[PDB]
């Protein structure tokens, strides 16, 4: 039965975004088996949230995010997940303030830049994204 | 009577404190459980900083 | 071969050490059981170590060079770290069976 | 094996010290985990290291790509005053809690004998393996506890595994990269490939 | 996972041998013979326990692996390689559903 766990791990390892099976198996394994699993569920939440964003639901997002919040209060990764939530519902400047903040309190943090760029690209603009990405690669 | 030319080298000490030694092993076992569950957590938290 | 993973390497080394540092202790306990002293004990270690190598060769069918480039680690392996452990189990069982 | 010893010795002085040392060798690992720190030093140094590693791999396996490209980057790195290396200018813990405990023991479990080692030892080493005894007649195989402790220490090392400057560096890279051959090394793969056959039998 | 049981059987038998030999030793020191060797049976028992245990521990010790990288690339395609998870964007068809 534990095969479900290993399949989720597989899809985590070799990035295989399809976000149809993932959400199913997640919501199955997000249940009581959680307490059985033991200190490993958190990754499964970080993985189900994104696939859910991909499926359109947005209802499971806040449940997973608030579990993450309550466990890891002063995190940075969950902040990135809130930025993701924002930019899916098209709050861009809010997300930019967020990412610039958690870069402002941690300059040597990459994910914020790599989400600023995803935002810049989702607007439609490319030519400035490229030079931003090169200034990063610099 | 009995005599002991060389101080009874093969009997334990006739003075042994059996309570200290049973108050030590449990100290270590609980310290070990402690510092097992207390490093897993700090490390996990290092991950999700 | 030209291109090496360098992770499977350490895995193989580990699954060697996990056999070796166990069998060492085991032979030590065996010797302490059928009590034999001085020289002969050391001989047993060598003999056991040799037998161990052979089994590995029989588990790595056909010498296959895709796992290892050279069979030296199977014979030499980790052989000093096996010694102290053999000594200890020898001593433990001797002091636990024949003296007491 | 000529003596007869109290079994209470086995019970209450032998197993305690094949246990204590094991749990202390575990605790040492866990506490070392809890101790180590980690700096956030600087963006500058991390970037510099990254580029130095790019240089390393260039010198190592920069022979699977077009020659002109290798030479182009080599020029971007070596070219006088444009080259990147020509513009930028700037035990005890182990041993001691093991040696402090032997002392405690030999102060505590002193006035008696513990066990026998089945290989004959040398005689001069007697006065420090027994340390309580006033026989000066025994063979030295009959030891005190401290020796058992140290033996355990050395014997359980291998059984935890089973259960668990800037500018000068830049210039040295530059100097070691000046002397370098492209050696494209791909110039017969075609024939070699179409030499025996194509190999695939897993469909 | 029968090899685990095999190893546990080897261990149990070996311990039985050790117990038998300790009590035999006591017999010896009690009858003050101190001349004779051990009975064969104990010896055979312990030796077979040793051999069997090694043959089982070799199996349960783990499994070897190739040291040629491309072995694990035989089964792989662009779809895995291309995703780049740290550059995701969701303004696409799926948001319809
Ligand atoms: C003499 C005493 C010293 C050694 C005797 C040999 C037996 C050693 C077993 C106890 C050690 C231990 O620490 O035992 C943990 C394992 C947990 O399984 P594992 O993941 O380590 O499997 C092995 C796969 N590897 C190596 C890739 C991780 O228990 C096991 O398998 C062992 C199963 C015990 C069978 C009864
Ligand atoms: C009696 C109760 C024993 C308490 C000690 C205990 O329970 O923890 C230590 C080991 C079991 O921990 P572990 O071997 O599974 O490795 C854990 C490390 N980790 C997570 C990396 C796999 O105790 C043991 O094996 C007992 C070993 C017997 C020697 C005496
Ligand atoms: C552990 C590895 C296996 C141990 C082998 C073993 O089994 O060592 C034999 C002893 C005999 O056992 P016994 O107490 O019945 O005879 C002695 C009772 N006396 C002294 C009061 C007359 O086992 C024991 O008791 C020793 C108990 C500690 C376990 C070692």
Curated annotation (Swiss-Prot), chain A:
TPR repeats by residue range: 76-109
**Post-translational modifications reported in the UniProt record:** Ubiquitinated when soluble in the cytoplasm, leading to its degradation by the proteasome. Interaction with EMC2 prevents its ubiquitination and degradation.
Keywords of the record: Acetylation, Endoplasmic reticulum, Membrane, Repeat, TPR repeat, Ubl conjugation
- GO annotation, biological process: protein insertion into ER membrane by stop-transfer membrane-anchor sequence; tail-anchored membrane protein insertion into ER membrane
One GO cellular component term noted in the UniProt record for this chain: cytoplasm
* Entry keyword annotation includes Acetylation: yes
Q: Per the record, what is the consequence of mutating residue 50 to K?
A: No effect on transmembrane domain binding of tail-anchored proteins
* Annotated compartments: Endoplasmic reticulum membrane
Q: What does this protein do?
A: Part of the endoplasmic reticulum membrane protein complex (EMC) that enables the energy-independent insertion into endoplasmic reticulum membranes of newly synthesized membrane proteins. Preferentially accommodates proteins with transmembrane domains that are weakly hydrophobic or contain destabilizing features such as charged and aromatic residues. Involved in the cotranslational insertion of multi-pass membrane proteins in which stop-transfer membrane-anchor sequences become ER membrane spanning helices.
Report the family membership.
Belongs to the EMC2 family.
Q: How does it associate, per the subunit comment?
A: Component of the ER membrane protein complex (EMC). Interacts with WNK1 (via amphipathic alpha-helix region); promoting the ER membrane protein complex assembly by preventing EMC2 ubiquitination.
* Source organism per UniProt: Homo sapiens
Q: Which residues of the full protein are shown?
A: 12 to 149 of 297
From Swiss-Prot, chain B:
Which compartments does it reside in? Endoplasmic reticulum membrane
Tell me the domain of life. Eukaryota
For the Cytoplasmic compartment, the record's topological domain ranges are 40-49
Q: List membrane-spanning regions.
A: 19-39
What quaternary arrangement does the UniProt entry report?
A: Component of the ER membrane protein complex (EMC).
Which illness does the annotation name? Cerebellar atrophy, visual impairment, and psychomotor retardation: An autosomal recessive, neurodegenerative disorder characterized by developmental delay, intellectual disability, hypotonia, scoliosis, cerebellar atrophy, and variable dysmorphic features.
Similarity annotation: Belongs to the EMC1 family.
Purpose of the protein? Part of the endoplasmic reticulum membrane protein complex (EMC) that enables the energy-independent insertion into endoplasmic reticulum membranes of newly synthesized membrane proteins. Preferentially accommodates proteins with transmembrane domains that are weakly hydrophobic or contain destabilizing features such as charged and aromatic residues. Involved in the cotranslational insertion of multi-pass membrane proteins in which stop-transfer membrane-anchor sequences become ER membrane spanning helices.
For this entry, the protein name equals ER membrane protein complex subunit 1
Q: Which organism is it from?
A: Homo sapiens (Human)
Curated annotation (Swiss-Prot), chain D:
Keyword Membrane listed: yes
The record's Gene Ontology cellular component field reads:
EMC complex; endoplasmic reticulum membrane; membrane
UniProt topology in membrane: Multi-pass membrane protein
Chief place of localization: endoplasmic reticulum
Q: What is the effect of changing residue 28 to K?
A: No effect on EMC assembly and no effect on membrane insertion of hydrophobic transmembrane helices-containing proteins by the EMC
Q: Which UniProt keywords apply?
A: Endoplasmic reticulum, Membrane, Transmembrane, Transmembrane helix
Q: Please indicate the ranges of residues that lie on the Lumenal side.
A: 1-11, 108-145
- SMART domains listed in its UniProt record: DUF106
Q: Name one GO biological process term.
A: protein insertion into ER membrane by stop-transfer membrane-anchor sequence
Which parts of the chain span the membrane according to its record? 12-35, 92-107, 146-164
What outcome is documented for mutating residue 157 to K in this protein?
No effect on EMC assembly and no effect on membrane insertion of hydrophobic transmembrane helices-containing proteins by the EMC
**Where in the cell does this protein reside?**
Endoplasmic reticulum membrane
Mapped to this chain, the residue ranges on the Cytoplasmic side of the membrane are 36-91
The answer to whether UniProt assigns keyword Ligase to this entry is: no
- Subunit arrangement? Component of the ER membrane protein complex (EMC).
| Annotated function | Part of the endoplasmic reticulum membrane protein complex (EMC) that enables the energy-independent insertion into endoplasmic reticulum membranes of newly synthesized membrane proteins. Preferentially accommodates proteins with transmembrane domains that are weakly hydrophobic or contain destabilizing features such as charged and aromatic residues. Involved in the cotranslational insertion of multi-pass membrane proteins in which stop-transfer membrane-anchor sequences become ER membrane spanning helices.
* PANTHER family per UniProt: ER MEMBRANE PROTEIN COMPLEX SUBUNIT 3
The UniProt similarity line reads: Belongs to the EMC3 family.
Q: What is this protein called?
A: ER membrane protein complex subunit 3
UniProtKB/Swiss-Prot annotation, chain E:
The role this protein plays is: Part of the endoplasmic reticulum membrane protein complex (EMC) that enables the energy-independent insertion into endoplasmic reticulum membranes of newly synthesized membrane proteins. Preferentially accommodates proteins with transmembrane domains that are weakly hydrophobic or contain destabilizing features such as charged and aromatic residues. Involved in the cotranslational insertion of multi-pass membrane proteins in which stop-transfer membrane-anchor sequences become ER membrane spanning helices.
Protein's gene: MMGT1
Topological domain (Lumenal) residues are 20-40
Q: How does it sit in the membrane?
A: Multi-pass membrane protein
GO molecular function annotation: cobalt ion transmembrane transporter activity; ferrous iron transmembrane transporter activity; inorganic cation transmembrane transporter activity; magnesium ion transmembrane transporter activity
Just give the chief location class: endoplasmic reticulum
Q: Transmembrane region positions?
A: 1-19, 41-60
Q: Which domain of life is it from?
A: Eukaryota
**What is the protein's given name?**
ER membrane protein complex subunit 5
Family of this protein: Belongs to the membrane magnesium transporter (TC 1.A.67) family.
GO terms under cellular component: early endosome; early endosome membrane; EMC complex; endoplasmic reticulum membrane; Golgi apparatus; Golgi membrane; membrane; plasma membrane
Q: Lineage of this protein's species?
A: Eukaryota, Metazoa, Chordata, Craniata, Vertebrata
């Amino acid at each position: 039965w534990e095969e479900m766990r290993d399949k989720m791990r597989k899809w985590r390892e070799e990035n295989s975004r399809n976000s149809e099976q993932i959400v199913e198996v997640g919501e199955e394994l997000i249940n009581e088996y959680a307490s059985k699993l033991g200190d490993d569920i958190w990754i499964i939440y970080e993985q189900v949230m994104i696939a859910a964003l991909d499926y359109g639901r947005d209802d499971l997002a806040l449940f997973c995010l608030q579990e993450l919040r309550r466990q890891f209060p002063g995190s940075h990764r969950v902040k990135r997940l809130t930025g993701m939530r924002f930019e899916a519902m098209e709050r861009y400047d809010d997300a930019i303030q967020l990412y610039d903040r958690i870069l402002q309190e941690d300059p040597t943090n990459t994910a914020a830049r790599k989400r600023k760029i995803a935002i810049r690209k989702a607007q439609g603009k490319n030519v400035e994204a490229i030079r931003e990405l090169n200034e990063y690669l610099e | 009577t009995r005599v002991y030319p060389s101080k009874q080298f093969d009997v334990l000490k006739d003075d042994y404190d059996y309570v200290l030694i049973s108050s030590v092993l449990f100290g270590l076992v609980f310290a070990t459980m402690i510092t097992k569950r207390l490093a897993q957590v700090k490390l996990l938290n290092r991950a999700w900083r | 071969p030209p291109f090496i993973s360098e992770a499977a390497v350490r895995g193989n080394a580990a699954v060697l050490d996990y056999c070796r540092t166990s069998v060492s202790a085991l032979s030590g306990a065996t010797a302490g059981i059928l009590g034999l002293t001085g020289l002969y004990g050391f001989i047993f270690y060598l003999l056991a170590s040799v037998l161990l190598s052979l089994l590995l060769i029989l588990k790595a069918g056909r010498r296959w060079n895709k796992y290892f480039k050279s069979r030296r680690p199977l014979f030499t392996g980790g052989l000093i770290g096996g010694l102290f452990t053999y000594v200890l189990f020898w001593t433990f069982l001797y002091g636990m069976v024949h003296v007491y | 094996p000529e003596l007869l010893l109290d079994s209470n010795i086995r019970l209450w002085v032998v197993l305690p010290i094949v246990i204590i040392t094991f749990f202390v060798g575990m605790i040492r690992h866990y506490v070392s985990i809890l101790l180590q720190s980690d700096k956030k030093l600087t963006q500058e140094q991390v970037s510099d290291s990254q580029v130095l590693i790019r240089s390393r791999v260039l010198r190592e396996n920069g022979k699977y790509i077009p020659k002109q490209s290798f030479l182009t980057r080599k020029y971007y790195f070596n070219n006088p005053e444009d080259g990147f290396f020509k513009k930028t200018k700037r035990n005890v813990t182990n041993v001691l809690p093991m040696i402090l405990i032997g002392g405690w023991i030999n102060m505590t479990f002193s006035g008696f004998v513990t066990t026998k080692v089945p290989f004959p030892l040398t005689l001069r080493f007697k006065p420090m393996l027994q340390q309580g005894i006033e026989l000066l007649t025994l063979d030295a195989s009959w030891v005190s506890s401290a020796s058992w402790y140290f033996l355990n220490v050395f014997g359980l090392r291998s059984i935890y595994s089973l259960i668990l400057d800037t500018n000068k560096a830049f210039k040295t890279e530059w100097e070691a990269l000046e002397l370098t051959d492209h050696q494209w090394a791909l110039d017969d793969v075609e024939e070699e490939l179409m030499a025996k056959d194509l190999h695939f039998e897993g469909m | 996972s029968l090899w685990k049981g095999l190893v546990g059987i080897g261990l149990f038998a070996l311990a039985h041998a050790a117990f038998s030999a300790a009590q035999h030793r006591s017999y010896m020191r009690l009858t003050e013979k101190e001349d004779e060797s051990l009975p064969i049976d104990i010896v055979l028992q312990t030796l077979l326990a040793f051999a069997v245990t090694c043959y089982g521990i070799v199996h349960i010790a783990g499994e070897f692996k190739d040291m040629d990288a491309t072995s694990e690339l035989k089964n792989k395609t662009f779809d895995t390689l291309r995703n780049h998870p740290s550059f995701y964007v969701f303004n696409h068809r799926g948001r319809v559903l």
